[PDB]
From a paper:
BER can be initiated by OGG1, a glycosylase that recognizes 8-oxoG across from cytidine (C) and excises the adducted base leaving an AP-site that is subsequently processed by downstream enzymes in the BER pathway. Mutations caused by oxidative damage are primarily prevented by the activity of base excision repair (BER), which eliminates 8-oxoG in duplex DNA. Cryo-electron microscopy structures of OGG1-nucleosome complexes indicate that these effects originate from OGG1’s ability to flip outward positioned 8-oxoG lesions into the catalytic pocket while inward facing lesions are occluded by the histone octamer. Cryo-EM structures of OGG1 bound to nucleosomes containing 8-oxoG revealed the enzyme uses a DNA sculpting and base flipping mechanism for repairing 8-oxoG in the nucleosome, providing a mechanistic basis for the elevated mutational density at bases facing the histone octamer.
To position the 8-oxoG into the catalytic active site, OGG1 binding induces significant structural changes in the nucleosomal DNA during 8-oxoG recognition.
Author numbering:
A (entry chain B): 24 to 101
B (entry chain F): 22 to 101
C (entry chain D): 32 to 124
D (entry chain H): 35 to 124
E (entry chain C): 12 to 118
F (entry chain G): 15 to 117
G (entry chain E), H (entry chain A): 38 to 133
Amino acid sequence: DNIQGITKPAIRRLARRGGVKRISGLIYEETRGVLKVFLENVIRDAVTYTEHAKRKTVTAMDVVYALKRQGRTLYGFG
Amino acid sequence: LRDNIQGITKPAIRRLARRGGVKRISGLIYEETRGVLKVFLENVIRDAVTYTEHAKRKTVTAMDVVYALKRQGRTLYGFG
Amino acid sequence: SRKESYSVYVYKVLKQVHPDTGISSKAMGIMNSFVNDIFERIAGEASRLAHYNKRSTITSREIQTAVRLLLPGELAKHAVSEGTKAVTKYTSS
Amino acid sequence: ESYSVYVYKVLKQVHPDTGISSKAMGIMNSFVNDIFERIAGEASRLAHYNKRSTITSREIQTAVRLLLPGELAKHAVSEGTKAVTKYTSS
Amino acid sequence: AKAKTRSSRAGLQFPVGRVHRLLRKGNYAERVGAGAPVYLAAVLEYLTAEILELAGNAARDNKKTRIIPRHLQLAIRNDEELNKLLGKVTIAQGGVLPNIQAVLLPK
Amino acid sequence: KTRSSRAGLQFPVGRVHRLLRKGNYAERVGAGAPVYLAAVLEYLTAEILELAGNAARDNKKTRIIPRHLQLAIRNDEELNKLLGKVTIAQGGVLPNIQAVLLP
Amino acid sequence: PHRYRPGTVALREIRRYQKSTELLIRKLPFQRLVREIAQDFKTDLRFQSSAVMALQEASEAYLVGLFEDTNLAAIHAKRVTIMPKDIQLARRIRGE
Amino acid sequence: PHRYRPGTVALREIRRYQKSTELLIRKLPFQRLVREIAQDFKTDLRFQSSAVMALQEASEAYLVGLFEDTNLAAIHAKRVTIMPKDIQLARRIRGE
DNA sequence: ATCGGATGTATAGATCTGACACGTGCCTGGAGACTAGGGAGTAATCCCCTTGGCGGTTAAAACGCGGGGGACAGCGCGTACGTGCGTTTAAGCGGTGCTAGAGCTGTCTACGACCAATTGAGCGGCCTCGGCACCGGGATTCTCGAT
DNA sequence: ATCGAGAATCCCGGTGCCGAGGCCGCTCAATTGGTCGTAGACAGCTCTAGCACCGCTTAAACGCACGTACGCGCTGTCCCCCGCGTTTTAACCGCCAAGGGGATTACTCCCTAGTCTCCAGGCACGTGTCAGATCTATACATCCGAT
């Protein structure tokens, strides 16, 4: 039940960085749902890479490879 | 050749919109569609011609077009 | 020069899936393009998996992980089951 | 193994009086690795497509023309051949 | 010793020797294991059968005994998993899935 | 004696040749391919670093941070095209506001 | 005389052009445009007929997908007609 | 008694978070959410701190880009307030 | 329009401090010389498939004219969402132990590359017919003017 | 909520044809059977970083009020796009002919893998130190309420 940890002010700050001036009340649930779907998709591949390497910890390179897989290449971690 | 982009006539753009499920079409849609089709065609044909030059060929084969499309993420099936 | 294709293999699969259904040449070429695309996708992902773990070979474990990465949802589970069945039957001659 | 010393040497060639942070250095290393793997993969596919088994400067040139955008490619090829022109002579 | 093809030893219809050869001469790794071609041929056979099942069903729905690219396109775009697998793929002579937005329908 | 010095470059020709060999890209690798690829990498690195140093100077700083790299990439028409699907960690985002939201 | 109301004939076209799989763009104008565009990159180019066919198929598929996204944007704007700004928004979100 | 007109402080903090380069989400709730999501795939699974940091960077970048597309769809419909229909349209056009 | 007050950044100036750039030892990965062999450059040849032209049919495109219906502007209501203040909460931070597991090392056995017969599955070319297309004709269905 | 005329589409029937399929001959790539070298499987060790815990501090989240401005529905206007009929026009199909260049083979030579020897370029490792993050005071860009 930690999806509520993504609070309303955090989503407002993300929208502010996105250039959003006004936010409806139902945005905060849709954003949590979208973030949950994105995190599930990334973590599934990260755990797949970890399992294939016969490891019990998710290294940063696993997340980097998983993100590069989905077309979301990330610089700064290897 | 001169202004063959007008060969993509307004009825053809209308038919393409109908297959895409468009009911009513504005008058300015046709020129925008011609421009977008032109840009996409140059983007694909540049890569196809690059593949043709690298093979030291003077003929643009269908497999060159397939490779050019796959390079842009289109991945056409059928031809080759 | 003799060209190779999966036409006979797709045709054999069709005769055990739909015994009285044919397939046109265009559709057969599309199926060949499908098989080539998936072969190259799975093999490239398996090559990346072998490179990441500093391994010099592509085993059935690399192909299994590549299948679990490329294929979505229940398609991946059934493909993994089919591949494991085939490898087990192969190792049992 | 990284490209830290080479990125720093290039930085002193272009900006003699500025430095680079460690995180920006890691991002530069990631950029170099990404571009290297992109060009090398496209060159390998170019070699495979034409039934060749050797990656030459022609494959790298075609891969550069395919990957990089227009004007940014035009200088890059102009650089690459130049290096080969210098490398072959000596 | 009678020659027994690896596909028959694995119960598959796709070739195992051909897939092994393509893996060896595809520049994927320095070495290729014995069970990798078997696994890959099984996976490819499964996917081929999965698409051919729905394509034949679509062909039968149109009172056709042959499969055309339209049937393959209908089969792939109607199945969610296959459509996700081939979402960035164009099929020659496949057309589009018939979908009309509810707003456009008559009042 | 070094091939990089022989070609007038700063990136290592020998290391790029070794990585081309180990990468399973092809059975054989030409002699001029590592030279060409090292030259391309050096040019691209120099372009990134020049624009990032300009951004750092415009921010009155004498050190390049990921924010400067992000500004350099996003403010150039072609570098943004080359790295369209790339996320810079701690790079931030390009400051812009839709004109309709302004009062 | 009999005149159908403006809504219905457009809908019949939608059904007709969604059921079938013909090209909908004439062969010769598209081929001529392809050769015009290719003149910029290399003069005296030979084109294989299968290459022009593949180019036409890919271009029309791209345009149909773009028109689907355009219609989605037009309906999202509480509208029925598609306008250039709809195509522009679709291309902006798609990343072009 | 000094009160700002609605929208002034909202246009502020936009410039602040365009200029700033922080994480915008508390680290511990995100880490707990990551662990809760991952426990569905493999129990007793450990995470490197850098791995969770990379996941966070990717999540914020994706959400920010999604919110820019959502804003574009919102102004497209002659609006300023973003509704979840804008998010749905942006995700559908993006192919997600 | 214009002024004044009150916020919220600019601007300058110290003040630490900890990453950053600079030396050191070394070692392992690059350089230099030399050889074998096969991959690719170069010539020559065949034929196919690409291009150009011409003529006739006619489907499709262009053009012009109603007419209605849909985009767009303008108003008003009301409610949802900002702004801000007070209160609550749990994140951040700083220490500590503790040990699970990630990484490195040293045998050693099995497994994949490699090479020489051996031959059967798969490809190229050839009839061969039946599944689908084309063309009439009728029935049924959808739309829209009307009440 | 119904009736009926006109236009569109679907199905039943007859006819034709050319593309999928079965088949035969013939290769050359898959199979069998051996060896050899080295890749990773596995046991052992280390040490490090991931996890858990606990107290303190305070920044951030949550809740509640209030005003207001923006979303949304309604209504009027006009203009522009759609349907339809009529007149070009060039797409399309069929045929014919010429030739450029795309595949092929044969030959050869030189370019690259491979090995041995040797050295210095770059990577841990350590360390001084100034670029910059933070704090504090003054200055003024901006926004909003009267006037």
